[model samples]
Target chain A: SHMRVIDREGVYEISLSPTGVSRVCLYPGFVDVKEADWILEQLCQDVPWKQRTGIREDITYQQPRLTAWYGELPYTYSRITMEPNPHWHPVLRTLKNRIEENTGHTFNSLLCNLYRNEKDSVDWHSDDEPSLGRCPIIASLSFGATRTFEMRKKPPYVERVKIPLDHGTLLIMEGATQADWQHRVPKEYHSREPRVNLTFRTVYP
Target chain B: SHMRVIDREGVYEISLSPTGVSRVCLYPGFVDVKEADWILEQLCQDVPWKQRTGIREDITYQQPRLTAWYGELPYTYSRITMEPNPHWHPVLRTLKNRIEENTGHTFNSLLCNLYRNEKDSVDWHSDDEPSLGRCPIIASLSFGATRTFEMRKKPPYVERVKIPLDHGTLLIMEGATQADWQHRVPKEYHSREPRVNLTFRTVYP
Candidate 1:
């Protein structure tokens, strides 16, 4: 009941904490309908999507959805490592360039998530990896099916924001957002088609 | 999966059947953002939203969200009766006139659904009540929040379509769609803002 909805296209000031300001911006139709459709089809057909595995509570299980990682350095998450692909996909490189020019942010890493269906979803988590450092910025561009990106503020702060990210939508999370909140793409109540979420970031060893 | 994603503006041919071919049309940004925002604010503030109860398995329970019916004839559904309102809201009347003029479909009734939050939703059902007659046309205009409108084809046929209905969106369901498909606004996996769905239709005694 305390959930606040932000569906309009504009910059949202999440909150002002000691970590500075946690904020987000939503740009719907970021790539236009035709290009979004084209990119979604390209990645779905060309990318090598594979499910990763992780250890949890002494149990090893495959992750819910498929993913493709592009970077010179290997990626680590949930105690699992995803080997790097030194060479980026041409489509991905094109997007990264466009986004960097648009946002004035340089990204050396691209992590693509493929939600094949409603059952394929991510649990609540944050992009607060040590390698990513503090005050990180993430540019998430989506295509194909739409998914709801939920943000639950860390305790002390009582607010939740639900964003329905659809085709060609770009959502930016910056400043202290990573430390101030955790986000997730939840399993839906009904059936849904495949969706692709491309997260661009800068990481270090 | 076999589910197809349709998130653009165009007329979609769902499928062909002997029962006159079911179809749907999607018009995104049917109402410009500023006007949609204004209308949504007005209706949410001015309308008298009430909860109606229904019986199933000989037990009575209240419906999830708030709703108001406008027409000269009583509306019946799920074994619940919604008394008619002889006069419609000025804003609603304006919208109805605008929609009728645009779609060229005459409508004399307006059923407004107010989804207060994520918990409020309508289950899978067709708008096939006797009062609405066969091959009923429903023009759904949404504002305030974005919710997924899911459609599942009747058995023997297996395909699902998920559309994110957002602010100022106008979706038209016509032909044999009511007979061949069942649609619902299912409860979301995350928290959401309140949304208003105004369904314009023609009812008979």
Candidate 2:
């Protein structure tokens, strides 16, 4: 009956293309405060997080952030494979359904990330895997401490676009984003509390 | 009249205030190429540069950048007094005349900063001392490698405005800039060559 853009949600057009547009949108209070506190606690305790091993200069090092994956098939990234874990936590499934209903974007898989402290980070990377299909759209939900999600245009020296991922916030990236940009959550200079980021995406195996 | 702003000189209005304005202007190639190269070499060896002693946390340490001063009166900063050396080098005196001639802003004192490498830096500070007088107007000239001169608002949760100071560049800050903003040249992340910054100001001592 009436139009309301709503004060809680926002959108950003990142780049332009002939047929499609690279975009990012967010809903800051997707889960609200009281529920996010409970959700954060449950996910932290329930997720079977693991520190993936990475090699650089022939020296082995533990990847900065702890990660977990949930999908019907096995997934691989950063020199490691996350064994298939279709058993998604009930809380996560509830959050997933809520996001799908809100964004009208369906996801058959989820990648969970836990940044233990300010030092933990995910380097620049793109969700351009062959399994993600073309023009992949994804949703990211945050809980606990806030962190910036930075994306830079690919095939170039373009700097970055920063979105502060705060508690109960939901961020969605759609259109030609994967092919045009690389994203990362860099290590913060100052101290930060533990943060959990759950990214929902469709994986066609 | 020939309509030419000239390719060399540039100006920037930093901020606004009552009665007068807080501002910074720059002239990137005030000295031109041949002259700046010769002047840079002359000042590097001619000026008697010294590493000022600084005390931090009750421990004495060398100041990050090499320093020299030219004025009739002694200058005090960061718990140290720079013994006055009014015998200005010929090359410096010539540059001073050119800057004053072009801007019509006179300066009787100079602070010389030599950043030997990227490790050298000048921390956040404002030239609001009593000696600098009301609404100090200053000129900054650069030689050798390019470096960023950053300023942030004083009563300030504000971030910064950056001006890249390259070889033969001249930057001027007028009005209430000294009282309303703090400036610094931060240590860079990557390697940088030697740089020289000559700041000319009117210090009424």
Residue B33, candidate 1: C-alpha displacement in angstroms = 40
Please name the candidate that would achieve the greatest lDDT relative to the true structure: 1
Question: Per-residue lDDT for B113-152 in model 2, tens only?
Answer: 9999999998888877776655666788999998888787
lDDT per residue for candidate 1 within B23-111, as digits (tens), equals: 78899999999999999999999887889886545678898979888874435553236665768889998898677555545577788
Off by over 4 Å in 2: A1-8, A54-61, A73-80, A156-159, B1-205
Window of ten residues with lowest summed lDDT in model 2 chain B: B1-10
lDDT of 2 by residue, A1-205 (tens): 1212222466666666432467778889888899999999999999999987755446677889998888643233442456547788899889886775444345788889999999999888878777766567789999999988887776542235777889999988876687677889999999999999998886655
Best by TM-score: 1
Which window of 10 residues has the lowest lDDT sum in candidate 2 chain A? A1-10
| lDDT agreement with native, every candidate | 0.81, 0.76
